[PDB]
C-alpha cells in the first residue's frame, strides 16, 4: 500500500513539478525519486484484472531515465517524461482498480491482488517515499498500532432507519403515544407524540426516550441540536406495525420539555447537555440518549384549549421533537462522509466491471448494510479499499 | 566469501552482470543497496543547448553515494568470512577498512571528478554518443588505488583559459567537420548532376576524410568507405554551394 | 509430509526466534536451517489450487541467504527475514489447503496435490529437520510401522444414534419392555425400561444388555460410569419403531442392579467392572457390554407400592440406567475430539472453497457418516488431511 | 511484554536446563542468553508498586555472570545459578502481579506498571529472545496487525442467563406457549413448550426460535448438537416474568421437528444444518439461530392421546428441546475456557491483594459481566492481563 | 506558537517522510531540520502543568542526531527515528493540551503555559521553519 501510494505520489509530483522552464533545483529530488521508480519497476512483469469484466492487462517496464545536469527544464525534457508518466499512471490506475475489487475474510488488510502482493516485495520498498496523505498516514500508524483517526465532515455513521414505536396503542389507532424517528447519515430526527396531549399523564408530563447505538466510537464530534423535527411535523398516514392497516397522524408541535442529550461510551456518561440547543461537543461516545418531555400548557388560549379536549376524540396530536446533526467527527475507523469520495470510487469501480459479490461486503457496496454490520473484517477490507481509492483518485 | 555464500558460477553472455545477480542473492541491506546503485548507475542522456550530453546521477555529483559504498564495505569489515584463513581474512578486512576510513577523501574525490566532468562537458559541441568502441583505454586498477589512497583535499578545477581552449578546439573540429561534409556533398552532387559517370567518389571521400585531420586513410575499411559515400550522397547540398552550382 | 512439516516448523521457529535485539547465538542453528531451506527451495516452480473455488497460485523461489554477522539481531535482519518468512508462510498455507481438499480411494496416504508430490522428491529431503509434533511423529512412526498413538480428550468415537429396542411390545404400546440409548461422541447413555416393573419376570428381575462396537480399538482409556441416564428419565412421547404412531414413556428411576461393564477385545473380556461407579480404566478394548438388571424392590412403602400394580394399566414405568463417558483415550487411528481442531480445520477449508464432494469422504465431512463407515481408505485420507491441518495450524 | 516474557522464558529455561551433571554444550546458548540478561538488567533499579495490598518492593541487579568453565555442570554451579534465578524469578513474578492488577480506559494494551513501562525501553531489547508461546505469539501478531488466533476448549463465550419468553401467556398461567433457555459457558440449552400441544396451531406446528448473539466472532468451531434439553425436561415452579406469582411447568418431551441450526456472520448464513445431530463444524460465525418446531403427533396411542386433550386444562405440556455445546473453537480475542487458567490467575491475584475496583473490569473480575459488555477497552486490558498471567505461570 | 507549530510540523514531516527504503535525497532537508530541532531542544527541561486533572509531566531532551550517510533509509534508521519522534510527539501533544486549557483576560494572545513561554525564548527560534497552515 505504501509502495503503491508512493508510485501514485511520484507520478502526481511528476505531473505537477516537471514543467517547462522550471529550475532543476526545483525538481532535483523529484527527478531522483522518479528515476528510482523507473529503475525499480524496470524488468518486472505485472498482470492486472481477471475478476468480473476487468480485462487482463499485462505491464512491462523498459523506460529510460531522466537527465540530471541541465539548469532549467525545457519542452524536450517534459516530452521525454510525459510518455513514461502516462504509462505509469495507467499501470497504477489499473493496479488500484484490481485491488479495490477484492476482499478476504481472513486477512482483509493484506494485499489481495497479485500486482499489489508483488509490490509488497522487499525490492520495491526503495520506491517508498513521503507518506503525507491522511489515509496513508492512518494506514501506517494503524499498522504500527498507534492511536490514529480519520476526520469526517457529516460522517455517515447512522444506517438508514425510519421507524416508530407506540407505547400506547389500540386497534383503531385513535389514542396513541410513542416516538417516530429517522436515522440517516449524520442526522437523527426524533419526535414523541401523544394523542391525548398528556391529559391523564402524571404531572401532565409525558416522557419520551430515544437511544441510538453507533457502530463505531466517534470522538471530538460537533453536534447541532434543534428543538423541532420537521420530518414528523405534518399530517401523515402511517402503516401499522405489522402492515395490517394504516393510522392517521396529525401533529401539532409543542416545544420539547426537559431536553437532555447524553453521549455515552460503554454505558458511561461522557457528555450531558440539558436544555442546550445549537452547537454542542461530544468528545468521546458510542451511544446517544435523547430524553424529552411533552408538558401540557398549564394556560391555554381559547384556540389552544380547543385543540386539546378532556377526552376522545383527539383530532390534534401533540408532538415534541429533536434534530441532531453531526457536523464533523473523528473516528478510528473509516466511514463514508459528505466530503470524501472513497465509497463512491469503490462502488463505481465495482459496478463498472460487474465484480461478483464477495464474502465480506454487501452486494452493490450498499452502505446501510455495510454500516449496520460493520465487523472488524469489514472494517479491515473497507480501510484497504478506501486507501486504494484515495491513492487512485490522486491520479484518476 | 564474506557472507558465506557459495561462489557465483557466472555464465558469460548472461543478460545479468555478476552484481545484478548478487543484488538479489544478498540479503544485507548495506551491500545490497550499494549493489543496486552500482547496477543502475548508467549515464543519463539529456540535450543541453541542442547538444546531447551523458550526465551522471545526482548522487555521484554530490558524492553522497560514497557513503553507501562505505556503509557496504564497513559491513564487509565486520563479516565472518566463515571458511577463510584468519590471516588472509584479516588482511582483506584491513584493506576494506583502508578504503573505508577515507570516506571524506573519497567523497571529495567523487565530487571533484564529477565537477570536472561537468565543467569540461559544458565545452563539448558534438553529441556525446555512447557506443562500445573496437579498442578500449586500459585502466590499471592500481592507478585507481593510487587515486583513492593519495587524493588529498586540494580542489583543482579547469582554468577559464583551459575551458576556453577546449571549447575552441571542439568548435573548430565541429565546424571543420561540417564544412568538409558540405564540400564533399557539393562535389559529389555536382559530379552527378554534371553526369561525370567516370568520376570516382572514393577519391572525394578520401579527401574528405583527410581534411578531417584525424584519420589515417590507409586503414579505413572499404565497406565503411562505401557506406560513407552512400551517406554523403543522401545529404542535401548546402545553400551557398548549391546556388553557385546552379 | 515431513518436508512440508519441516518447512512449517522452520517458518514457525523463524517467526518466534528471529526477533529484534536477540543474540545471534540464539538463532545460529536456526539461521543455518533457514538458509538450507532457502537453498533447497530456490529455483523451483510450484502451483497450488485449481480445485473448487481455491484459486490457482504460482510460486517461484529466488531469495538470498541470511549471512550478516551480528551479536544481537537488529531491525534490518528482522525485516529481511520477515519478508522471506511471509512469502514462505503464504506458500506453505496454500500447499496445506491444496492437500487438505483432496482425496483418493487408492493410496490416500500418499500426497495428492502436485505441490506436495514435488516436495516429496529426494532433492527436497535437505529441508527436513526436527519432527516433534504428535501428528508428524505418528506419521513417521507409521511409515516405519512402529506402534502409533493419538491421545484424545473425549474422543469422538461413537457415531450419533438415538435409538431404542423393544423386547416386549404391542400395538397399544402400554406394556413395553426394552432399552433406549444415545451414543454420541464420547458419551453412551442407556436406559432399560420395563412397564410392568418385573411383576411377572423370573425372580422379579429383568435383564438389559447394550453392546456398543467401537470402530477402532481404544487403549489406556479413562471412563466415568454413573448409575443414572438423565437423558431417559423424564416423560417422553416417542415415535413408533416404524413411525406409524407414538407411544408414551413415564419413567420412575430405580437404581440399576447387578451392573457389569465388560470392555472386550476380539470378544475376549479384557476389563470387567462389577457394581463399580466413578473413574475406571479400560486398558485395551473395541467393544463395550453394559449389562444391568431392573430388580423389583422386595419391600416397598405405600407410595412406592402404589406405582407398580399387579396388572395393567401401568401408569409409572420402571427404568434403570447407565451413563458412560470416555474422558480420555489413546487410539492408533486418528479421530475427532473435544480438544483438537483438525476436523474443524479440514471441514472449514472444504466449505469455504466449495470443494466438490470427493470419492472418499461423505458430503460436508459429516463426522457421523465418516466414523460409521471408517474404512481403511477413509482412515488413510483422514490421517493425511489431519496431519496437513496440524502443519497449517502451526502457521495459520 | 516481549521483554518480560523473554525474562520469564530465560528463567524457566535456566531452571529446566541448568541441572547437576548436564553437559555445558546443552546450556551454552542458554548460558549466553542468561548472561546477556544479567548484563542488561545489571545497574538498573526497579520498583513494583503498592496498589491494593501488594507490598512496595525495590529491586536492584548487581549479579555476576554465570560461569563457562565446567565441562559438566556440578552442584556449586547449580547452587549459584539457583540463587540468581530465584532473585530474578521473584522480580519477574512481582512485576507480573503489579501489571495484572492494573487497567486503563485510554490505552489498556500499553503497560500500566512503571516496571513494565521501564522494561519497554530500547536498552532492554537485548534481553528479547524466542517468543514461542501462544499468548506471546498472538501479542506480537497483534502489535504488527496480523491475524491473531486463540484456540479454546469449551470457550466461555456465552454469559450466564437463565431466562424464558412467553409468546402466549395469561394471568393464571395454564395455557402457555414460549421458550426457556440457559446460555452458560460454551453451552446453550433451549426448550420450546406449548401447553396446548399445538392443538389450535395453523398446521399443528408451533415454531420456536432462539437467537444467541456471540460477543466475538468464533472460527473453526466443533459443536455437539443434541435433540433434547435435559435441563428443561422435569417439572418446575417458575417465577412469573415480574415476580408477582409462580407458574407450573410439567414438560412431556417430544422430538424437535424441522431443526435448523444456522451459524450467521454479519447476518449472512455461513453454515446451516438441517436435522443434523452430533458433531458439526461452524467455520466462521458470530450468531447462532436455532429453529425448531413442536409438531403434534398425527397418530397417538391411547396414552399419548390421553396426555393432550382438545381443550383446557392442559396438565401435560408438550416440550421440544435442543442442546448445543462448543467443544472447541478459535477466536481472535482472548476468552476464558475450561483448559487455560488465565482468568483464574488474574482473579486470584486481584482478590489476594484486595485490588480496588478499577474503571474497566467488573467489580469482582466476574466473567459474566465482563463478557456481557465486552468493550474494546475491556478486550485490550484483558489481553494484556492474560498475557502477563501466562508469563507469570511459566514461572509460578 | 511558531516554534511549537514548527516542532509539530517537523515531527509530522518526520513521521510521513522517514519511511523504510526511502532515498535520503527525499529527507536531506528534513533530516537537517530534525537535527537542528534535536540540538536546540537538547539539554532543556520542560514541565507541562497540573491545571485541572491534567497530569504534571516533566520532559528532558537528550537525543542523538539522526544519521546521514544512507542512500536509502533502512529499518534501523526508521526505528531510531521513531523512538525519538514518539518522545517528541508526546511532548508536543502535552504542551499543546497544557496551552489549550489556559486563558487570560489581558494578553490572551500571548502564551499562557510555562512550556510555551519557554519555547518563545530566542534560543528556540532556530527550530522555526515553514509556516504554511
Ligand atoms: Cl470437557
Ligand atoms: Zn399500530
Ligand atoms: Zn413401537
Ligand atoms: Zn474437556
Ligand atoms: Zn408469566
Q: 524466542: which residue's cell?
A: D130
Rg (CA), chain D: 28
Q: Coil, strand or helix: which one is B180?
A: helix
**Partners of A207 in beta bridges:** A293
**Residues contacting D83, CB < 8 A, separation 6+:** none
Contact between chains at A132 and E20 (C-beta distance less than 8 A): no
Experimental approach was cryo-EM
Closest CA to D44 of D3, D15, D102: D3
Contact between chains at A69 and B36 (C-beta distance less than 8 A): no
| CA-based nearest distance A107→chain D, Å | 6
Contact between chains at C234 and D253 (C-beta distance less than 8 A): yes
Q: Is D299 annotated as a binding residue?
A: no
Q: 530566542: which residue's cell?
A: E122
Distance D179 CA to ligand 5 centre (A): 12
Q: How many helices (H) and strands (E) does chain C have?
A: 9, 14
Closest CA to D150 of D224, D223, D216: D216
Grid coordinates belonging to A24: 532543476
Burial class (CB in 10 A: 0-12, 13-18, 19+), A298: exposed
Q: 495490598: which residue's cell?
A: D53
Q: Is E104 on the interface with B (CB under 8 A)?
A: no
The Cα angle at residue C352 between residues C350 and C355, in degrees rounded to 5: 40
CA atoms of B103 and A227, how far apart (whole Å): 74
CA atoms of B75 and B3, how far apart (whole Å): 10
Helix (H) or strand (E) holding D209: strand D205-226
**Partners of C305 in beta bridges:** none
The C-alpha torsion from A48 through A51 and A52 to A54, rounded to 10°, is: 0
The answer to whether residues C30 and C331 touch, using CB atoms and an 8 Å cutoff, is no
C-alpha of A86 from chain center: 32
Other residues' Cβ atoms within 10 Å of the Cβ of residue C86: 17
Largest CA distance in chain D: 94
CA atoms of D311 and D394, how far apart (whole Å): 66
**Residues contacting A26, CB < 8 A, separation 6+:** A17
**Partners of B53 in beta bridges:** B46
Chain B residues with beta carbon closer than 8 angstroms to that of A32: 57-59
The answer to whether residues C381 and C103 touch, using CB atoms and an 8 Å cutoff, is yes
Rg (CA), chain C: 28
Quote the DSSP letter at residue C21: T
Q: Is B4 on the interface with C (CB under 8 A)?
A: yes
The answer to whether residues D146 and C86 touch, using CB atoms and an 8 Å cutoff, is no
Helix (H) or strand (E) holding A63: none
- Rounded (to 5) percent helix, strand, coil in chain B: 60, 5, 35
Q: Is A70 on the interface with B (CB under 8 A)?
A: yes
CA atoms of A36 and B236, how far apart (whole Å): 43
Which chain C residue shows the shortest CA-CA distance from B30?
C76
The length of chain B in residues reads 246
The answer to whether residues C178 and C236 touch, using CB atoms and an 8 Å cutoff, is no
Q: 411377572: which residue's cell?
A: C200
Q: Least CB-CB distance to C67: which of B4, B24, B29?
A: B4
What are the E-state strand segments in chain C? 45-48, 57-60, 150-153, 158-168, 177-185, 187-194, 205-226, 236-239, 246-249, 251-253, 257-265, 268-274, 278-295, 317-331
Which chain E residue shows the shortest CA-CA distance from C80?
E75
The answer to whether residues A75 and A29 touch, using CB atoms and an 8 Å cutoff, is no
* Whether residue D37 has a cis bond before it, omega within 30° of 0: no
* Positive/negative CA dihedral, D135, D137, D140, D141: negative
The answer to whether residues E116 and E59 touch, using CB atoms and an 8 Å cutoff, is no
Q: Coil, strand or helix: which one is B66?
A: helix
CA atoms of D273 and A320, how far apart (whole Å): 49
Q: What is the DSSP string of B119-168?
A: HHHTT--S-------SS-----HHHHHHHHHH--S------HHHHHHHHH
CA atoms of D88 and D5, how far apart (whole Å): 13
Half-sphere exposure of A83 (CA within 13 A, CB side): 10
Closest CA to A65 of A95, A34, A90: A34
Q: Least CB-CB distance to A29: which of E13, E15, E26?
A: E26
Grid coordinates belonging to D360: 474497566
**Partners of D192 in beta bridges:** D179, D320
CA atoms of A34 and C249, how far apart (whole Å): 85
Label residue C150 left, alpha or beta by phi (over 0 means left) and psi (-120 to 50 means alpha). Answer: beta
Q: Coil, strand or helix: which one is E59?
A: strand
Other residues' Cβ atoms within 10 Å of the Cβ of residue B16: 14
Cβ-Cβ pairs closer than 8 A, B with C, add up to 35
Q: Do B and D count as touching (3 or more CB pairs closer than 8 A)?
A: no
Label residue E107 left, alpha or beta by phi (over 0 means left) and psi (-120 to 50 means alpha). Answer: left
Half-sphere exposure of B217 (CA within 13 A, CB side): 14
Chain E residues with beta carbon closer than 8 angstroms to that of B104: none
Quote the DSSP letter at residue C232: G
| Helical packing angle, C75-100 and C2-17, nearest 10° | 150
Contact between chains at A140 and E20 (C-beta distance less than 8 A): no
Distance D293 CA to ligand 5 centre (A): 22
Q: Is B39 on the interface with E (CB under 8 A)?
A: no
Q: What's the reported resolution, in angstroms, to a tenth?
A: 2.9
| CA-based nearest distance B48→chain A, Å | 6
Grid coordinates belonging to B9: 558460477
Chain B residues with beta carbon closer than 8 angstroms to that of C67: 2-5, 26-28, 79
Chain E residues with beta carbon closer than 8 angstroms to that of A33: 23, 25-26
DSSP H helices, B3-140, are 18-25, 29-40, 58-61, 65-78, 86-100, 103-121
CA atoms of E48 and C235, how far apart (whole Å): 74
CA atoms of D327 and D154, how far apart (whole Å): 5
| CA-based nearest distance A125→chain C, Å | 11
CA atoms of E36 and E66, how far apart (whole Å): 10
Distance C166 CA to ligand 3 centre (A): 7
Distance A305 CA to ligand 4 centre (A): 72
DSSP H helices, D28-112, are 28-41, 75-100
Which chain C residue shows the shortest CA-CA distance from A118?
C87
The answer to whether residues D287 and D352 touch, using CB atoms and an 8 Å cutoff, is no
| CA-based nearest distance C44→chain E, Å | 29
The answer to whether residues C30 and C151 touch, using CB atoms and an 8 Å cutoff, is no
Grid coordinates belonging to D323: 442442546
Strands A158-168 and C187-194: unpaired
Q: Is C83 on the interface with B (CB under 8 A)?
A: no
What are the E-state strand segments in A231-316? 236-239, 246-249, 251-253, 257-265, 268-274, 278-295
Closest CA to B188 of B178, B197, B177: B197
Quote the DSSP letter at residue A223: E
CA atoms of C275 and C45, how far apart (whole Å): 65
Distance D304 CA to ligand 3 centre (A): 13
C-alpha of B186 from chain center: 34
Contact between chains at E78 and C75 (C-beta distance less than 8 A): yes
Q: 461478483: which residue's cell?
A: A356
Phi, psi of D115 (to 5 degrees): -65, -50
Contact between chains at A67 and B46 (C-beta distance less than 8 A): yes
Closest CA to E58 of E43, E71, E47: E47
Closest CA to D148 of C7, C77, A376, C85: A376
Contact between chains at D107 and A373 (C-beta distance less than 8 A): no
**Residues contacting D129, CB < 8 A, separation 6+:** C17, C19, C22, C23, C26, D6, D9, D10, D33
First to last CA, chain B: 75
Which chain A residue shows the shortest CA-CA distance from B50?
A76
C-alpha of E105 from chain center: 29
Rg (CA), chain B: 26
CA atoms of C61 and C46, how far apart (whole Å): 9
Q: 524536450: which residue's cell?
A: A76
Label residue D198 left, alpha or beta by phi (over 0 means left) and psi (-120 to 50 means alpha). Answer: left
Among all bound ligands, the one having the nearest atom to the CA of D304 is: 3
CA atoms of D284 and A108, how far apart (whole Å): 15
Distance D240 CA to ligand 5 centre (A): 4
C-alpha of D226 from chain center: 23
**Partners of A285 in beta bridges:** A218
Phi, psi of C156 (to 5 degrees): -90, 80
Strands C317-331 and C251-253: parallel
Q: Is C210 annotated as a binding residue?
A: no
Q: Coil, strand or helix: which one is D65?
A: coil
Closest CA to E23 of D240, B65, A102: B65
Grid coordinates belonging to B244: 553557385
**Residues contacting E22, CB < 8 A, separation 6+:** A128, A129, A130, E72, E73
**Residues contacting B204, CB < 8 A, separation 6+:** B184, B187, B188, B191, B229, B232
Chain E residues with beta carbon closer than 8 angstroms to that of C78: 75
Q: Which residues of E touch C (CB under 8 A)?
A: 20, 74-76, 78-79
CA atoms of B176 and A363, how far apart (whole Å): 76
Q: 391555554: which residue's cell?
A: A300
Other residues' Cβ atoms within 10 Å of the Cβ of residue D55: 9
Rg (CA), chain E: 16
Q: Do E and A count as touching (3 or more CB pairs closer than 8 A)?
A: yes
The answer to whether residues D95 and D48 touch, using CB atoms and an 8 Å cutoff, is yes
Distance D242 CA to ligand 5 centre (A): 7
The answer to whether residues A281 and A223 touch, using CB atoms and an 8 Å cutoff, is yes
Touching C: which chains, 3+ CB pairs < 8 A? A, B, D, E
CA atoms of C290 and A233, how far apart (whole Å): 76
What are the E-state strand segments in A56-176? 57-60, 150-153, 158-168
Phi, psi of C312 (to 5 degrees): -75, 155
**Residues contacting A324, CB < 8 A, separation 6+:** A187, A188, A189, A190, A223, A224, A225, A261, A288, A290
Chain C residues with beta carbon closer than 8 angstroms to that of D125: 20-21
The Cα angle at residue E60 between residues E55 and E65, in degrees rounded to 5: 135
Distance A318 CA to ligand 2 centre (A): 18
Among all bound ligands, the one having the nearest atom to the CA of C169 is: 3
Q: Coil, strand or helix: which one is D58?
A: strand
Q: Is A35 on the interface with B (CB under 8 A)?
A: yes
Phi, psi of B9 (to 5 degrees): -100, 80
Half-sphere exposure of A368 (CA within 13 A, CB side): 6
Which chain D residue shows the shortest CA-CA distance from A104?
D147
What are the E-state strand segments in A102-245? 150-153, 158-168, 177-185, 187-194, 205-226, 236-239
The length of chain A in residues reads 396
CA atoms of E77 and E87, how far apart (whole Å): 16
The Cα angle at residue C95 between residues C379 and C90, in degrees rounded to 5: 140
Closest CA to C91 of C381, C295, C396, C328: C396
Task: Give residues after which chain B gaps, C-N over 2.5 angstroms.
Answer: none
Q: What is the DSSP string of D272-334?
A: EEES--EEEEEEEEEEEEEEEEEEPPSS--HHHHHHS-SSS---SEEEEEEEEEEEEEEESS-
Chain E residues with beta carbon closer than 8 angstroms to that of A140: 15, 19
Chain D residues with beta carbon closer than 8 angstroms to that of C247: 301, 303-304
The answer to whether residues D3 and D127 touch, using CB atoms and an 8 Å cutoff, is yes
Among all bound ligands, the one having the nearest atom to the CA of C187 is: 1
The answer to whether residues D204 and D295 touch, using CB atoms and an 8 Å cutoff, is yes
Phi, psi of A60 (to 5 degrees): -125, 140
Q: Is D239 annotated as a binding residue?
A: no
Burial class (CB in 10 A: 0-12, 13-18, 19+), E97: middle
Rg (CA), chain A: 28
Amino acid at each position: 500500500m505504501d509502495v503503491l501510494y508512493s508510485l501514485s505520489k511520484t507520478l502526481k509530483d511528476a505531473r505537477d513539478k516537471i514543467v517547462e522552464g522550471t529550475l532543476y533545483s526545483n525538481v532535483s529530488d523529484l527527478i531522483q525519486q522518479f528515476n528510482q521508480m523507473i529503475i525499480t519497476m524496470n524488468g518486472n512483469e505485472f498482470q492486472t484484472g481477471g475478476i468480473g469484466n476487468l480485462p487482463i492487462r499485462n505491464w512491462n517496464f523498459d523506460f529510460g531515465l531522466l537527465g540530471t545536469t541541465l539548469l532549467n527544464l525545457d519542452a524536450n525534457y517534459v516530452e521525454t517524461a510525459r510518455n513514461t508518466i502516462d504509462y505509469f499512471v495507467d499501470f497504477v490506475d489499473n493496479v488500484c482498480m484490481d485491488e479495490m475489487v477484492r476482499e478476504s475474510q481472513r486477512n482483509g488488510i493484506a494485499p489481495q491482488s497479485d500486482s499489489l502482493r508483488k509490490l509488497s516485495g522487499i525490492k520495491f520498498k526503495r520506491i517508498n517515499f513521503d507518506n503525507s496523505s491522511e489515509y496513508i498516514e492512518n494506514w501506517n500508524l494503524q499498522n504500527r498500532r498507534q492511536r490514529t483517526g480519520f476526520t469526517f465532515h457529516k460522517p455517515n455513521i447512522f444506517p438508514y432507519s425510519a421507524s416508530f414505536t407506540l407505547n400506547r396503542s389500540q386497534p383503531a389507532h385513535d389514542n396513541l403515544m410513542g416516538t417516530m424517528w429517522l436515522n440517516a447519515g449524520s442526522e437523527i430526527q426524533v419526535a414523541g407524540f401523544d394523542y391525548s396531549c398528556a391529559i391523564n399523564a402524571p404531572a401532565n408530563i409525558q416522557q419520551f426516550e430515544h437511544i441510538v447505538q453507533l457502530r463505531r466510537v466517534l470522538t471530538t464530534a460537533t453536534i447541532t441540536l434543534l428543538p423541532d423535527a420537521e420530518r414528523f411535523s405534518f399530517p401523515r398516514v402511517i402503516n401499522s406495525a405489522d402492515g395490517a392497516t394504516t393510522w392517521y397522524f396529525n401533529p401539532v408541535i409543542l416545544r420539547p420539555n426537559n431536553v437532555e442529550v447524553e453521549f455515552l461510551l460503554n454505558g458511561q456518561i461522557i457528555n450531558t447537555y440539558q436544555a442546550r440547543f445549537g452547537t454542542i461537543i461530544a468528545r468521546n461516545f458510542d451511544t446517544i440518549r435523547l430524553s424529552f418531555q411533552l408538558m401540557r400548557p398549564p394556560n391555554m388560549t381559547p384556540a389552544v384549549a380547543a385543540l386539546f379536549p378532556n377526552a376522545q376524540p383527539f383530532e390534534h396530536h401533540a408532538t415534541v421533537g429533536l434534530t441532531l446533526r453531526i457536523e464533523s467527527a473523528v473516528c478510528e475507523s473509516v466511514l463514508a462522509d459528505a466530503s470524501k469520495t472513497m465509497l463512491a470510487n469503490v462502488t463505481s469501480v465495482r459496478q463498472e466491471y460487474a465484480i461478483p459479490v464477495g464474502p465480506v461486503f454487501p452486494p452493490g457496496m450498499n452502505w446501510t448494510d455495510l454500516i449496520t454490520n460493520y465487523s472488524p473484517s469489514r472494517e479491515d477490507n473497507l480501510q484497504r479499499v478506501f486507501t486504494v481509492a484515495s491513492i487512485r483518485s490522486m491520479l484518476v | 566469501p564474506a557472507f558465506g555464500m557459495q561462489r557465483m558460477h557466472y555464465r558469460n553472455g548472461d543478460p545479468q552482470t555478476p552484481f545484478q545477480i548478487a543484488e538479489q542473492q544478498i540479503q544485507n541491506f548495506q551491500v545490497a543497496n550499494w549493489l543496486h546503485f552500482v547496477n543502475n548507475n548508467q549515464f543519463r542522456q539529456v540535450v543541453i543547448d541542442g547538444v546531447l550530453n551523458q550526465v551522471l546521477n545526482d548522487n555521484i555529483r554530490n558524492g553522497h553515494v560514497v557513503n553507501q559504498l562505505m556503509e557496504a564495505l564497513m559491513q564487509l569489515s565486520r563479516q565472518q568470512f566463515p571458511t577463510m584463513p584468519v590471516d588472509y581474512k584479516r588482511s582483506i578486512q584491513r584493506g576494506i577498512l583502508l578504503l573505508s576510513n577515507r570516506l571524506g577523501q573519497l567523497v571529495d574525490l567523487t565530487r571533484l571528478l564529477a565537477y570536472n566532468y561537468e565543467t569540461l562537458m559544458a565545452c563539448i559541441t558534438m553529441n556525446m554518443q555512447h557506443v562500445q568502441t573496437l579498442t578500449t583505454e586500459k585502466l590499471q586498477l592500481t592507478s585507481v588505488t593510487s587515486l583513492c589512497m593519495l587524493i588529498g583535499n586540494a580542489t583543482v578545477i579547469p582554468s577559464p583559459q583551459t575551458l576556453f581552449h577546449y571549447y575552441n578546439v571542439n568548435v573548430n573540429f565541429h565546424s571543420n567537420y561540417n564544412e568538409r561534409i558540405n564540400d564533399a556533398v557539393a562535389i559529389i552532387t555536382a559530379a552527378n548532376r554534371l553526369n561525370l559517370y567516370q568520376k570516382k567518389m572514393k577519391s572525394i571521400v578520401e579527401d574528405f576524410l583527410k581534411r578531417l585531420q584525424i584519420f589515417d586513410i590507409s586503414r579505413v575499411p572499404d565497406d565503411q568507405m562505401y557506406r560513407l559515400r552512400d551517406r554523403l550522397r543522401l545529404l542535401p547540398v548546402e545553400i551557398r554551394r548549391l546556388d553557385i552550382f546552379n
